[PDB]
Nucleic acid binder design. Structure first.
Ligand SMILES: N=C(N)NCCC[C@H](NC(=O)[C@@H]1CCCN1C(=O)[C@H](N)Cc1ccccc1)C(=O)CCl
Lengths: 253, 36
DNA sequence: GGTTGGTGTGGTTGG
C-alpha cells in the first residue's frame, strides 16, 4: 500500500498470501470467506499477455500472517489449493473485466485469532454502505510506491469510494459497472492507493449496523500508484456476488 | 461462504469479538456522516 | 529476520 501505515495484530484475520512455489514468491493478497473458500483476483492467476497462468499445484496459500517476509514460527497456515475456478467472462484482452476467482483450498483451516472469515455482502449493507464519500481500506503486502520497495509487515491505507463521472474521464480504459474506484480528489491534502503486489486484496468496510466487515471490492488495477488525479480500480464484489455463491453450491464445503 | 454466511463472518477475535477498536476504524465509521 | 521477545508465540542468529 502507498502512503499507508503498518497494520496491527489481525487488522485483517482474513488476509491471505498468493505464493508462487518456483521460485519462492508472493503473487498477491486474498480473503478467507469459508473454512476453505478463499477469493482473489483472476489476473493474479491468469494474465496471458504477460504470460501469467498460475496453476493449483503451483500456488501456496499463506493464511493468518503479519511479517511479509518471515514464516511465523506458529502463526502462519501454509496451505494447498485443491481448485481454482476463475470467472468465465473475465476479460483480460480488454480491461481486467470480471477479474475474479475462488480457489477451493485443499482442506478446512481453523480460525485461530488471526485466521478468520469476513462477511460476504448483502443488498442491505451494500446498498447503503456503497455510497461515494464513504471510505473502506485495502490491506496488502506490496510495492510501497512504484519501484524496486517491499515492506516488513502488512500495510493498510484508508480510502473513499469515487463516483463514476471521475473514474471515467480519469482513464482511456473503458470502465465497466463491475468495478468502482477508491481514491482522493487532489484538493484533498491526503492520499494512498494499492499497487503492484496488492491485488486479490480486500477493500473491506464497516457496517455501522451489524458491526461486521464485508467485501465491497478487491484490488483490480490502476494507472500507477498515486498518480495525483488517477484512481485505483477495485471490483464490485457485490454486482457479481452471484457468480460466487454458485461455485460453492456446486463444489466443496 | 455466501453473505455474512460463515456464522460469524467479519467479526474479529482480537478486536470486535473482543470490543477492542482499531487504530483507524473510527476513521471510516466517521465517513458515513456518522454511522455508529 | 532480527534486539533470544515478538506473534517468525519457542529455545536451537538457526531452523
Ligand atoms: N493505484 C493502484 N492501486 N494500483 C494497483 C494496481 C494493481 C496491479 N495491476 C494489475 O492488477 C493489472 C494486471 C495487468 C495489468 N494491470 C494493471 O493494473 C495495468 N497497470 C493496466 C491495466 C488495467 C486494466 C486492464 C488492462 C491493463 C495488481 O494489483 C496486480
Amino acid at each position: 500500500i502507498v502512503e499507508g501505515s503498518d497494520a496491527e495484530i489481525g487488522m485483517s484475520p482474513w488476509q491471505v498470501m498468493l505464493f508462487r512455489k518456483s521460485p519462492q514468491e508472493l503473487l498477491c493478497g486474498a480473503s478467507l470467506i469459508s473454512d476453505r473458500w478463499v477469493l482473489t483476483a483472476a489476473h493474479c492467476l491468469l494474465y496471458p499477455p504477460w504470460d501469467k497462468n498460475f496453476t493449483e499445484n503451483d500456488l501456496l496459500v499463506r493464511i493468518g500472517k503479519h511479517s511479509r517476509t518471515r514464516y511465523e514460527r506458529n502463526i502462519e497456515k501454509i496451505s494447498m489449493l485443491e481448485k481454482i475456478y476463475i470467472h468465465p467472462r473475465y476479460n483480460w484482452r480488454e480491461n481486467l473485466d470480471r477479474d475474479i476467482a475462488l480457489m477451493k483450498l485443499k482442506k478446512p483451516v481453523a480460525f485461530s485469532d488471526y485466521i478468520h472469515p469476513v462477511c460476504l455482502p448483502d443488498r442491505e449493507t451494500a446498498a447503503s454502505l456503497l455510497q461515494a464519500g464513504y471510505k473502506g481500506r485495502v490491506t496488502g503486502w506490496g510495492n510501497l510506491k512504484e519501484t524496486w520497495g517491499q515492506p516488513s509487515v502488512l500495510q493498510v491505507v484508508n480510502l473513499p469510494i469515487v463516483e463514476r463521472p471521475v473514474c471515467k474521464d480519469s482513464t482511456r480504459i473503458r470502465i465497466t459497472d463491475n468495478m468502482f474506484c477508491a481514491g482522493y480528489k487532489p484538493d484533498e491534502g491526503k492520499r494512498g492507493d494499492a499497487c503492484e503486489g496488492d491485488s486479490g486484496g480486500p477493500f473491506v468496510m464497516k457496517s455501522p449496523f451489524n458491526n461486521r466487515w464485508y467485501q465491497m471490492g478487491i484490488v483490480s488495477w490502476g494507472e500507477g500508484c498515486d498518480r495525483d488525479g488517477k484512481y485505483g480500480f477495485y471490483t464490485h464484489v457485490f454486482r457479481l456476488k452471484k457468480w460466487i455463491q454458485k461455485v460453492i453450491d456446486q463444489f466443496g464445503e | 461462504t455466501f453473505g455474512s454466511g460463515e456464522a460469524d463472518c467479519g467479526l474479529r477475535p482480537l478486536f470486535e469479538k473482543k470490543s477492542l477498536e482499531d487504530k483507524t476504524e473510527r476513521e471510516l465509521l466517521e465517513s458515513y456522516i456518522d454511522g455508529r
